């Protein structure tokens, strides 16, 4: 199911990027 | 490309149809996709009947039938040889096998 | 099956008469006089017909 797993991989990367940027200011 | 005109299912004029669990593997599939087989047999085999009729206490008795209804998914029906694959024109025949 | 031996026709008709119903005590005895399985004559056909004609007289069923 590679497209469903590429979608899951992007969601966890975006959750990391969310928490990283919103801490800065 | 589309393989079957009926999508491999009986559903026309409906949204949802309830599932059933298979008699071999307990996989979950729709009641109208499942492959049916109703089996009627004697409790005593055609070899054994004579040995069990002569020890009977009664002057007349008739040995009972056993009734079972079976449900398969496509993978179990193919692997257990209940159904075979067919030629592109032969797939259209809806009549059951000869006796 | 329907009747396994024609003797067990009377052993049925006697039970509807014990319950007090005469119509279903006929029909049993009618088919047993009218089925190809029991067309060879036997001592039990007299007791059958002697019960049958008593019921046809008492219910006044001439046909």
């Amino acid at each position: 199911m590679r497209a469903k797993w590429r979608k899951k991989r992007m969601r966890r990367l975006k959750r990391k990027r969310r928490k990283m940027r919103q801490r800065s200011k | 490309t589309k393989k079957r005109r009926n999508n491999g299912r009986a559903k026309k004029g409906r949204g949802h149809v309830q599932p059933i669990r298979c008699t071999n593997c307990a996989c979950c599939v729709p009641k109208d996709k499942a492959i049916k087989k109703f089996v009627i047999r004697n409790i005593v085999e055609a070899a054994a009947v004579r040995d069990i009729s002569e020890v009977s206490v009664f002057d007349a008795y008739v040995l009972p039938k056993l009734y079972v209804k079976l449900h398969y998914c496509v993978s179990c029906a193919i692997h257990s040889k209940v159904v075979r694959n067919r030629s592109r024109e032969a797939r259209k025949d809806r009549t059951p096998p000869p006796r | 099956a329907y009747f396994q031996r024609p003797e067990n026709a009377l052993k049925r008709a006697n039970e509807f008469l014990e319950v007090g119903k005469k119509q279903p005590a006929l029909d049993v005895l009618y088919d047993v006089m009218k089925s190809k399985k029991h067309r060879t004559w036997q001592k039990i056909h007299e007791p059958i017909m002697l019960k049958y004609l008593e019921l046809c007289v008492d219910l006044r069923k001439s046909h």
Partner: protein, 215 residues
Amino acid sequence: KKVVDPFSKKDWYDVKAPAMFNIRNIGKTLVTRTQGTKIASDGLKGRVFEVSLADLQNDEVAFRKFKLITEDVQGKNCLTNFHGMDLTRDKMCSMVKKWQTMIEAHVDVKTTDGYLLHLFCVGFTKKCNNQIRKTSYAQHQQVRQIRKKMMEIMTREVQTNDLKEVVNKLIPDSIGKDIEKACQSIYPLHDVFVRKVKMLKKPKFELGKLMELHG
């Protein structure tokens, strides 16, 4: 228990049926003979026997089963009474088939005696002898009209009778034959039976009424 030959300590007893049935001997059964605080009759009472009607009546009908209970022990005899009736598994499996309607009903009722009974009834639609169509289905209002007639006839026969007259109707099953006659004006029916009876409650022990069913 690790007894050496416990079958040396067992007494055989006879089992006797109610006086309605044409053959009155059921068979034989075991119990351990009496010891301090453990009497043999307390082990024999309350046992259930299930018997084919063809062994109570010496016909071939075979497919009705009757249940009997032990109530008291007299000498080497155990005395029994009615507890229910049922149809054999292979009979009911042979009736339910495709392209037909199946109709069922049930009631709770009392006799003129104190017994409370629960009854179940079944019937199936009939293929007419000229029919060229493949299916014999009834419409929903025809099914509702038939079910009211099943309950109406089935309650009428129990309310005004005792357990003696109730069992005399169940032996030939005149109940199912009267339902089958009445419904032919709504939709013809081809198999019709009282398929099960359960007993829910019963009166005091009453030894005189027990012996009236045995003398």
